[PDB]
């Protein structure tokens, strides 16, 4: 009702003290498919479910590597996902060249949240509609930074974003005491991650063509599994 | 569909330009006639008071270049800038090609200018319309008229401004192509006298100009205007 | 080498001078003051389109604090209106 | 965002909303009038003092644009002040330093009308809410008294009155003005006319009056090289205003 | 070698040059030029483009005098910020409005003169030893062509180099006309 | 915009060729400015007006000294009408130094500026590229050295207007003479010059 | 080419001014102020066109012909433009002020420093010899015909020469 | 949705550009026909008031080069400027490249210009639809293209624009056989005259005709009164 | 989609070539598609010029969609180019030795 009088643009607040336009951007994540990530001292793993338009089409790239030490998964708007992924890759390369130093995970997270926030302050530009999980390993150990389009970034042992992600988040809440201690056994950690996403499905089953897994660690450079490779983890 | 000049209405018409066409209809009548041997411009000045300095006002007619003169209707402020641009363009053409500007090329330039301000949203249409008169080897004497829409048309005898329909009818009834300047003057004065809302149209209400016979362009001061008005015996 | 020595520096004197002034203001008054001043300048230039009068905006003079000063660049100041519309809108 | 829709647009009746509203704002402004005499011009206005604590001196409503030209207004004062600053800068840069002499009233009035006009049709500026009486002397045209409206329309006069007292003062001038007025009678007529619109105190601190008369070498500031003529603009002091008013 | 000669006569304007070097500007006006390759021809075709643009816009050819003024102005504009690069031009045509043929010379600095006859290069001082005597503004076009033939004969006399033979272009009330080599 | 360089290459090419560059006008030999107890006197072998009581004498190129001085005179006129108060010399000096620095001395002006303002009398000097100096007595130009010698051999504190004029004229002539005197609280005074073959064919051309 | 460097001389007497040229004329007029120019052909032609443009604009804006002193200031200001790229010109201006009625003459340098005088002015090649032969040959307050004789003799004592005699309301061109 | 250029209608339209195209219907009728080797353009000149000066600015059909012709309907003021830009482009191409503009290239440029004036909401799109026609340089194939305010352009054997367009287009659809297009100039001119006569009730004084032929030949007729009579005899 | 028989059915290209091995078919408001095809051809020719090798179809598709992305911020931080997205959709077809015949 009255919401329709104040959600017209990113600038106008509402008398309740809310900002509906970026709230809609946050809600946009619910349309995207579930993507899950989890942390262990030696390894941090991503698990994502790819959606395809129709049986005639190929499956989408839910996971993008940025460097041999980090990468990210995403859900929500395709254009914003592309923009943010390319910007982050560009800045990672910029850091690696200008400073000869691998871009720190937290540094990248804040560097990207600053970009995401600025669009919420100026008229015309719209808030980004892509939630993404940045995962990487560096000198400071394994990290997994949940990202939200409203500049909010936090380090989590694990999480799920996208449609029906709350079930996977509940399973992760119930197994946090367990899967963290699985450090030193990447197969078991990936199995736990997959068992987390399985709770998010209501219609379709995990299969070598839709599921896709990425892992990174001290002994494992950021690697992406897909196709027949993920059969043993299903 | 009139707050913006850049948008067509569903009927495929511009309301903003049509309003400007309405505006000039409020301004004082300006009338021009082409004779076999010269052109005559007459103009009834809308603004009038016993205190106004008729001897030097001459804001109803303007000179652009030797052998080119224009009568204007509408806003004097809008008229002034276009007149200045026309003078600059004519003198620039003279400087470049070392020949006097053919009046058609001048009218083309000013018509494009007036159209242009109908184009950019931050610019309103010029609320003025000009009667052009001049001499050139291309076609001799010729009268051109241009509206806020940015179009132009050639004429033998035309009227502009308030009650333009009545003056046009009178001209269409009385005009002949073999007339000479000294008789075109009588025709124009008669038309203005029968078009005005004044009782007798005394010399104060009237501003006048003519081009005749290499070619002498003369704008009459009020004394000779009265002399001519009594010569024709209004 | 073929140009007059003073040409390169004088060509853009006003803009480089303003940039240096804004740099000094940022050093002294923080990021906020240059932001405000540059945004004033851009919001004045953006909204003022008038191809016929190259004379320039009055408020531009007001904001540069040159409303009471004269420079040789002021004494001695494809050209159709539509070309100006294209150039200004970048369309 | 690279364009702004014009603030001024035609009403369906062919009029301009902002120009008419600006003219109305001029009407509500305080009275100001000027008279062209045979050998001089007089321009006067009332000071709209907020309270008797205001210094009359700083309310310099009349101000000279050149040693030959003086301007007075009615309506939105700050607009007039900024416009006078721009007009003086134009009078110097555009005309003097090119032709080496101060511009005549006609050309300067045209330039100021140009400034006012471009404001009438723009994407981010409203028309100026003032109308200026611009008296002055020209080496050829002689004494002249031009009026300029918010829209930029300008046209000369022998006498005028703009603002709150416009109609009554204009009708009074229409009956009192005559052809062979000497400046010392033009000042008298202006003071008598302004008395009709002034309410409350009417003395040298409430009316600002300036006259464009003969050369005043006393105001030139330097002597020798008599080729340079003294300024013609001359503001009258409060004491002299009281003296002229007393009779 | 690059040289141009031009002779105005009571009925026509005769232009000749060593081989090209010539561009038509309108049905009754044409231009011939010399100078270093590339820059001069670039300027010549730019002038042709502008003049044809004006002709199409007004749908009316332009008088030779106006074309000469335009060419001088544009040369002064081009030389505004670069080395003069030594271009020389001749402009001839039939001023159909005033019914008189006119020939104009323009030099690299940007001057213009209504020469009865002119030249550039080697022919600026030789063939004047003959023009000074044989020339008159009253002769017919054929006499002008014969005079040009004698001028090129004099050029051959002065030049041991194997002269290539100039092309001859004439302009009359009929418009620009090419004449077979002679 | 501004002082266009739109012929520099052409001028260089012409100079390389036989076409001789016409020479610019000079500005005499000597200039002096002498401050005295109640005013300052500026003398030259023409003077340039910046403001009624601000005066300048310019060595070097006459065209440049005229142009820059007159431009800053107009600008100070705008300033004075802007702040509605008397202009003061130090503002003129700041403007001149900034201006001649902006053009890096390619504007060939060596100016002496003197005037009286609500702060009293002032006297200064501006070289090219902004090199400025102040002093009780100054001199510029080729003949300035002898005029100086005279000045420091004669100048003293508290001397009056007549002695100031005498000293200024003597210093100039030690190098006609026109001198300008500024008195605090009074108008500046400009003292100019103080020291059958005709074979005919006729026609009328229209005005 | 022989076309550059032509002499120009200006002289004033009783109630008239005489401006003459040693020859494509080099003396040009706008309204009633006459401008003689010496220098490169390109510069004289370009200055002619530019000054015609500016003076015509001034005439149209004022509805009044431009007076010789105002024109003098205009030409000085124009020549100062391109101060770093000056024209190769030595122009000379002459005319009769309409209102005050005093004859006027003024010279210039290539940058526009007004070298005003009211006895005579010369510019161009052999300027020194011409100045000497005019000073030894000039007298003030001459009648218009005597002024014409004097200026013609001065040029002859330096073919093609054009001399303008300018009155209050009439100007007589003459070729020698 | 109709308030601006930048927003699609829910069904996929852009109502503002469609309104501009409708405004193109306001102007007088113009038609073009491709013959076997000649192209004929006819235009319904607005009935001239007897006070108009017939000897000046009579033609809407105008030239863009020695071998190209442009005709239009709609807002005349916009059309003049579009023609001016087309001429500028044609001469710029002749300068930068030795070969003149291909008719396809010129119509592509005009379509781009019209489209570019629609890319941003700050500018009104031209209320005009040009009918560029001509022959490609040194090539005998006739070409005829139509442009629209949206920038969409297409080549036609025959096409009509402007006031009462549908009546003419239907008539051409029936009477023009692509298997045997009118070969000789006379037949094409007669077809054009018949087509316009279905709209212009007024006599031949209203119908202007332009004939463009290969090898850079353009001519405007003043004898179609005979053609009008012949169609009258056939009627 | 010949609206009338008078239109030249042979001169309305809903199918076009981008490179020797790469072409595409389009639908929608052809005005935007003209710019899209021109950009695709420019990218292909520039790639062949710079790298002296055939353009991979996936790279061309990414480049084209990048232009289509410009209603907002570009894939490399470029400012918005237009007020509206393209009203055009197309399917690219081509062959690459590393991908075989494929349709995007």
JSON list of C-alpha atoms in Angstrom, two decimals, chain E residues 26-156:
[
{"chain": "E", "resi": 26, "resn": "UNK", "atom": "CA", "xyz": [31.73, 23.13, -60.49]},
{"chain": "E", "resi": 27, "resn": "UNK", "atom": "CA", "xyz": [30.27, 23.05, -64.01]},
{"chain": "E", "resi": 28, "resn": "UNK", "atom": "CA", "xyz": [32.04, 26.35, -64.80]},
{"chain": "E", "resi": 29, "resn": "UNK", "atom": "CA", "xyz": [34.97, 26.55, -62.35]},
{"chain": "E", "resi": 30, "resn": "UNK", "atom": "CA", "xyz": [38.08, 24.41, -62.02]},
{"chain": "E", "resi": 31, "resn": "UNK", "atom": "CA", "xyz": [41.28, 24.53, -59.99]},
{"chain": "E", "resi": 32, "resn": "UNK", "atom": "CA", "xyz": [44.90, 23.70, -60.79]},
{"chain": "E", "resi": 33, "resn": "UNK", "atom": "CA", "xyz": [47.73, 23.60, -58.27]},
{"chain": "E", "resi": 34, "resn": "UNK", "atom": "CA", "xyz": [51.38, 22.78, -57.61]},
{"chain": "E", "resi": 35, "resn": "UNK", "atom": "CA", "xyz": [53.40, 21.95, -54.52]},
{"chain": "E", "resi": 36, "resn": "UNK", "atom": "CA", "xyz": [54.77, 18.97, -52.63]},
{"chain": "E", "resi": 37, "resn": "UNK", "atom": "CA", "xyz": [52.79, 15.78, -53.17]},
{"chain": "E", "resi": 38, "resn": "UNK", "atom": "CA", "xyz": [50.26, 14.58, -50.62]},
{"chain": "E", "resi": 39, "resn": "UNK", "atom": "CA", "xyz": [49.54, 17.78, -48.71]},
{"chain": "E", "resi": 40, "resn": "UNK", "atom": "CA", "xyz": [48.66, 19.93, -51.73]},
{"chain": "E", "resi": 41, "resn": "UNK", "atom": "CA", "xyz": [46.47, 17.25, -53.32]},
{"chain": "E", "resi": 42, "resn": "UNK", "atom": "CA", "xyz": [44.81, 16.61, -49.95]},
{"chain": "E", "resi": 43, "resn": "UNK", "atom": "CA", "xyz": [43.95, 20.31, -49.69]},
{"chain": "E", "resi": 44, "resn": "UNK", "atom": "CA", "xyz": [42.74, 20.39, -53.29]},
{"chain": "E", "resi": 45, "resn": "UNK", "atom": "CA", "xyz": [40.33, 17.49, -52.83]},
{"chain": "E", "resi": 46, "resn": "UNK", "atom": "CA", "xyz": [39.17, 18.97, -49.52]},
{"chain": "E", "resi": 47, "resn": "UNK", "atom": "CA", "xyz": [38.33, 22.18, -51.37]},
{"chain": "E", "resi": 48, "resn": "UNK", "atom": "CA", "xyz": [36.53, 20.16, -54.04]},
{"chain": "E", "resi": 49, "resn": "UNK", "atom": "CA", "xyz": [34.48, 18.42, -51.36]},
{"chain": "E", "resi": 50, "resn": "UNK", "atom": "CA", "xyz": [33.49, 21.69, -49.67]},
{"chain": "E", "resi": 51, "resn": "UNK", "atom": "CA", "xyz": [32.60, 23.46, -52.93]},
{"chain": "E", "resi": 52, "resn": "UNK", "atom": "CA", "xyz": [30.51, 20.53, -54.12]},
{"chain": "E", "resi": 53, "resn": "UNK", "atom": "CA", "xyz": [28.79, 20.44, -50.73]},
{"chain": "E", "resi": 54, "resn": "UNK", "atom": "CA", "xyz": [27.86, 24.10, -51.10]},
{"chain": "E", "resi": 55, "resn": "UNK", "atom": "CA", "xyz": [26.71, 23.56, -54.69]},
{"chain": "E", "resi": 56, "resn": "UNK", "atom": "CA", "xyz": [24.42, 20.70, -53.64]},
{"chain": "E", "resi": 57, "resn": "UNK", "atom": "CA", "xyz": [23.08, 22.60, -50.63]},
{"chain": "E", "resi": 58, "resn": "UNK", "atom": "CA", "xyz": [22.15, 25.75, -52.57]},
{"chain": "E", "resi": 59, "resn": "UNK", "atom": "CA", "xyz": [21.58, 23.86, -55.85]},
{"chain": "E", "resi": 60, "resn": "UNK", "atom": "CA", "xyz": [23.45, 26.70, -57.53]},
{"chain": "E", "resi": 61, "resn": "UNK", "atom": "CA", "xyz": [27.04, 26.79, -58.74]},
{"chain": "E", "resi": 62, "resn": "UNK", "atom": "CA", "xyz": [29.34, 29.36, -57.16]},
{"chain": "E", "resi": 63, "resn": "UNK", "atom": "CA", "xyz": [31.03, 32.28, -58.89]},
{"chain": "E", "resi": 64, "resn": "UNK", "atom": "CA", "xyz": [34.79, 31.95, -59.54]},
{"chain": "E", "resi": 65, "resn": "UNK", "atom": "CA", "xyz": [35.50, 35.02, -57.40]},
{"chain": "E", "resi": 66, "resn": "UNK", "atom": "CA", "xyz": [33.66, 33.58, -54.40]},
{"chain": "E", "resi": 67, "resn": "UNK", "atom": "CA", "xyz": [35.45, 30.26, -54.90]},
{"chain": "E", "resi": 68, "resn": "UNK", "atom": "CA", "xyz": [38.79, 32.07, -54.94]},
{"chain": "E", "resi": 69, "resn": "UNK", "atom": "CA", "xyz": [37.95, 33.90, -51.72]},
{"chain": "E", "resi": 70, "resn": "UNK", "atom": "CA", "xyz": [36.91, 30.61, -50.11]},
{"chain": "E", "resi": 71, "resn": "UNK", "atom": "CA", "xyz": [40.13, 28.91, -51.23]},
{"chain": "E", "resi": 72, "resn": "UNK", "atom": "CA", "xyz": [42.26, 31.74, -49.84]},
{"chain": "E", "resi": 73, "resn": "UNK", "atom": "CA", "xyz": [40.38, 31.64, -46.54]},
{"chain": "E", "resi": 74, "resn": "UNK", "atom": "CA", "xyz": [40.76, 27.88, -46.21]},
{"chain": "E", "resi": 75, "resn": "UNK", "atom": "CA", "xyz": [44.46, 28.03, -47.07]},
{"chain": "E", "resi": 76, "resn": "UNK", "atom": "CA", "xyz": [44.94, 30.68, -44.38]},
{"chain": "E", "resi": 77, "resn": "UNK", "atom": "CA", "xyz": [43.06, 28.39, -41.99]},
{"chain": "E", "resi": 78, "resn": "UNK", "atom": "CA", "xyz": [45.18, 25.34, -42.88]},
{"chain": "E", "resi": 79, "resn": "UNK", "atom": "CA", "xyz": [48.45, 27.28, -42.54]},
{"chain": "E", "resi": 80, "resn": "UNK", "atom": "CA", "xyz": [47.22, 28.51, -39.15]},
{"chain": "E", "resi": 81, "resn": "UNK", "atom": "CA", "xyz": [49.30, 26.11, -37.04]},
{"chain": "E", "resi": 82, "resn": "UNK", "atom": "CA", "xyz": [51.79, 24.27, -39.29]},
{"chain": "E", "resi": 83, "resn": "UNK", "atom": "CA", "xyz": [54.70, 24.74, -41.65]},
{"chain": "E", "resi": 84, "resn": "UNK", "atom": "CA", "xyz": [53.46, 26.52, -44.82]},
{"chain": "E", "resi": 85, "resn": "UNK", "atom": "CA", "xyz": [54.35, 23.40, -46.89]},
{"chain": "E", "resi": 86, "resn": "UNK", "atom": "CA", "xyz": [54.60, 25.47, -50.09]},
{"chain": "E", "resi": 87, "resn": "UNK", "atom": "CA", "xyz": [51.29, 25.09, -51.94]},
{"chain": "E", "resi": 88, "resn": "UNK", "atom": "CA", "xyz": [50.45, 27.16, -55.03]},
{"chain": "E", "resi": 89, "resn": "UNK", "atom": "CA", "xyz": [47.07, 27.33, -56.76]},
{"chain": "E", "resi": 90, "resn": "UNK", "atom": "CA", "xyz": [45.32, 28.82, -59.77]},
{"chain": "E", "resi": 91, "resn": "UNK", "atom": "CA", "xyz": [41.54, 29.18, -60.06]},
{"chain": "E", "resi": 92, "resn": "UNK", "atom": "CA", "xyz": [39.75, 29.86, -63.32]},
{"chain": "E", "resi": 93, "resn": "UNK", "atom": "CA", "xyz": [36.13, 29.80, -64.41]},
{"chain": "E", "resi": 94, "resn": "UNK", "atom": "CA", "xyz": [33.27, 31.45, -66.27]},
{"chain": "E", "resi": 95, "resn": "UNK", "atom": "CA", "xyz": [31.50, 33.98, -64.04]},
{"chain": "E", "resi": 96, "resn": "UNK", "atom": "CA", "xyz": [28.21, 33.10, -65.69]},
{"chain": "E", "resi": 97, "resn": "UNK", "atom": "CA", "xyz": [26.36, 35.57, -63.46]},
{"chain": "E", "resi": 98, "resn": "UNK", "atom": "CA", "xyz": [28.43, 38.47, -64.83]},
{"chain": "E", "resi": 99, "resn": "UNK", "atom": "CA", "xyz": [29.36, 36.79, -68.14]},
{"chain": "E", "resi": 100, "resn": "UNK", "atom": "CA", "xyz": [33.12, 37.33, -67.79]},
{"chain": "E", "resi": 101, "resn": "UNK", "atom": "CA", "xyz": [35.88, 34.70, -67.43]},
{"chain": "E", "resi": 102, "resn": "UNK", "atom": "CA", "xyz": [38.11, 35.26, -64.41]},
{"chain": "E", "resi": 103, "resn": "UNK", "atom": "CA", "xyz": [41.47, 33.81, -63.37]},
{"chain": "E", "resi": 104, "resn": "UNK", "atom": "CA", "xyz": [42.85, 34.03, -59.83]},
{"chain": "E", "resi": 105, "resn": "UNK", "atom": "CA", "xyz": [46.20, 33.03, -58.36]},
{"chain": "E", "resi": 106, "resn": "UNK", "atom": "CA", "xyz": [46.72, 32.01, -54.74]},
{"chain": "E", "resi": 107, "resn": "UNK", "atom": "CA", "xyz": [50.06, 31.49, -53.01]},
{"chain": "E", "resi": 108, "resn": "UNK", "atom": "CA", "xyz": [51.20, 29.43, -50.05]},
{"chain": "E", "resi": 109, "resn": "UNK", "atom": "CA", "xyz": [51.03, 32.40, -47.68]},
{"chain": "E", "resi": 110, "resn": "UNK", "atom": "CA", "xyz": [47.36, 32.89, -48.56]},
{"chain": "E", "resi": 111, "resn": "UNK", "atom": "CA", "xyz": [47.30, 35.82, -50.99]},
{"chain": "E", "resi": 112, "resn": "UNK", "atom": "CA", "xyz": [45.03, 36.22, -54.00]},
{"chain": "E", "resi": 113, "resn": "UNK", "atom": "CA", "xyz": [45.36, 38.28, -57.19]},
{"chain": "E", "resi": 114, "resn": "UNK", "atom": "CA", "xyz": [43.19, 38.66, -60.30]},
{"chain": "E", "resi": 115, "resn": "UNK", "atom": "CA", "xyz": [46.06, 37.97, -62.66]},
{"chain": "E", "resi": 116, "resn": "UNK", "atom": "CA", "xyz": [45.44, 38.14, -66.42]},
{"chain": "E", "resi": 117, "resn": "UNK", "atom": "CA", "xyz": [48.02, 35.33, -66.63]},
{"chain": "E", "resi": 118, "resn": "UNK", "atom": "CA", "xyz": [50.15, 33.49, -64.11]},
{"chain": "E", "resi": 119, "resn": "UNK", "atom": "CA", "xyz": [52.37, 30.53, -63.40]},
{"chain": "E", "resi": 120, "resn": "UNK", "atom": "CA", "xyz": [54.38, 28.80, -60.69]},
{"chain": "E", "resi": 121, "resn": "UNK", "atom": "CA", "xyz": [57.57, 26.81, -60.50]},
{"chain": "E", "resi": 122, "resn": "UNK", "atom": "CA", "xyz": [60.04, 27.17, -63.32]},
{"chain": "E", "resi": 123, "resn": "UNK", "atom": "CA", "xyz": [57.47, 29.01, -65.46]},
{"chain": "E", "resi": 124, "resn": "UNK", "atom": "CA", "xyz": [57.28, 31.98, -63.08]},
{"chain": "E", "resi": 125, "resn": "UNK", "atom": "CA", "xyz": [60.09, 33.86, -64.84]},
{"chain": "E", "resi": 126, "resn": "UNK", "atom": "CA", "xyz": [60.42, 32.06, -68.16]},
{"chain": "E", "resi": 127, "resn": "UNK", "atom": "CA", "xyz": [57.41, 32.19, -70.46]},
{"chain": "E", "resi": 128, "resn": "UNK", "atom": "CA", "xyz": [57.05, 35.67, -68.98]},
{"chain": "E", "resi": 129, "resn": "UNK", "atom": "CA", "xyz": [59.71, 36.75, -71.48]},
{"chain": "E", "resi": 130, "resn": "UNK", "atom": "CA", "xyz": [57.00, 35.82, -74.01]},
{"chain": "E", "resi": 131, "resn": "UNK", "atom": "CA", "xyz": [53.80, 36.67, -72.11]},
{"chain": "E", "resi": 132, "resn": "UNK", "atom": "CA", "xyz": [55.02, 40.22, -71.51]},
{"chain": "E", "resi": 133, "resn": "UNK", "atom": "CA", "xyz": [55.08, 40.76, -75.28]},
{"chain": "E", "resi": 134, "resn": "UNK", "atom": "CA", "xyz": [52.45, 38.51, -76.88]},
{"chain": "E", "resi": 135, "resn": "UNK", "atom": "CA", "xyz": [49.69, 38.79, -74.27]},
{"chain": "E", "resi": 136, "resn": "UNK", "atom": "CA", "xyz": [46.58, 40.94, -74.63]},
{"chain": "E", "resi": 137, "resn": "UNK", "atom": "CA", "xyz": [43.17, 40.76, -72.89]},
{"chain": "E", "resi": 138, "resn": "UNK", "atom": "CA", "xyz": [41.34, 41.15, -76.22]},
{"chain": "E", "resi": 139, "resn": "UNK", "atom": "CA", "xyz": [42.32, 37.96, -78.06]},
{"chain": "E", "resi": 140, "resn": "UNK", "atom": "CA", "xyz": [40.04, 35.02, -78.78]},
{"chain": "E", "resi": 141, "resn": "UNK", "atom": "CA", "xyz": [40.35, 31.59, -77.19]},
{"chain": "E", "resi": 142, "resn": "UNK", "atom": "CA", "xyz": [42.22, 30.09, -80.15]},
{"chain": "E", "resi": 143, "resn": "UNK", "atom": "CA", "xyz": [44.85, 32.83, -80.01]},
{"chain": "E", "resi": 144, "resn": "UNK", "atom": "CA", "xyz": [45.21, 32.12, -76.29]},
{"chain": "E", "resi": 145, "resn": "UNK", "atom": "CA", "xyz": [45.77, 28.44, -77.02]},
{"chain": "E", "resi": 146, "resn": "UNK", "atom": "CA", "xyz": [48.38, 29.35, -79.64]},
{"chain": "E", "resi": 147, "resn": "UNK", "atom": "CA", "xyz": [50.10, 31.61, -77.11]},
{"chain": "E", "resi": 148, "resn": "UNK", "atom": "CA", "xyz": [50.13, 28.76, -74.58]},
{"chain": "E", "resi": 149, "resn": "UNK", "atom": "CA", "xyz": [51.61, 26.49, -77.25]},
{"chain": "E", "resi": 150, "resn": "UNK", "atom": "CA", "xyz": [54.36, 29.04, -77.84]},
{"chain": "E", "resi": 151, "resn": "UNK", "atom": "CA", "xyz": [54.94, 29.31, -74.08]},
{"chain": "E", "resi": 152, "resn": "UNK", "atom": "CA", "xyz": [55.41, 25.55, -73.77]},
{"chain": "E", "resi": 153, "resn": "UNK", "atom": "CA", "xyz": [57.69, 25.70, -76.82]},
{"chain": "E", "resi": 154, "resn": "UNK", "atom": "CA", "xyz": [59.78, 28.26, -74.95]},
{"chain": "E", "resi": 155, "resn": "UNK", "atom": "CA", "xyz": [59.77, 25.97, -71.91]},
{"chain": "E", "resi": 156, "resn": "UNK", "atom": "CA", "xyz": [61.10, 23.15, -74.09]}
]
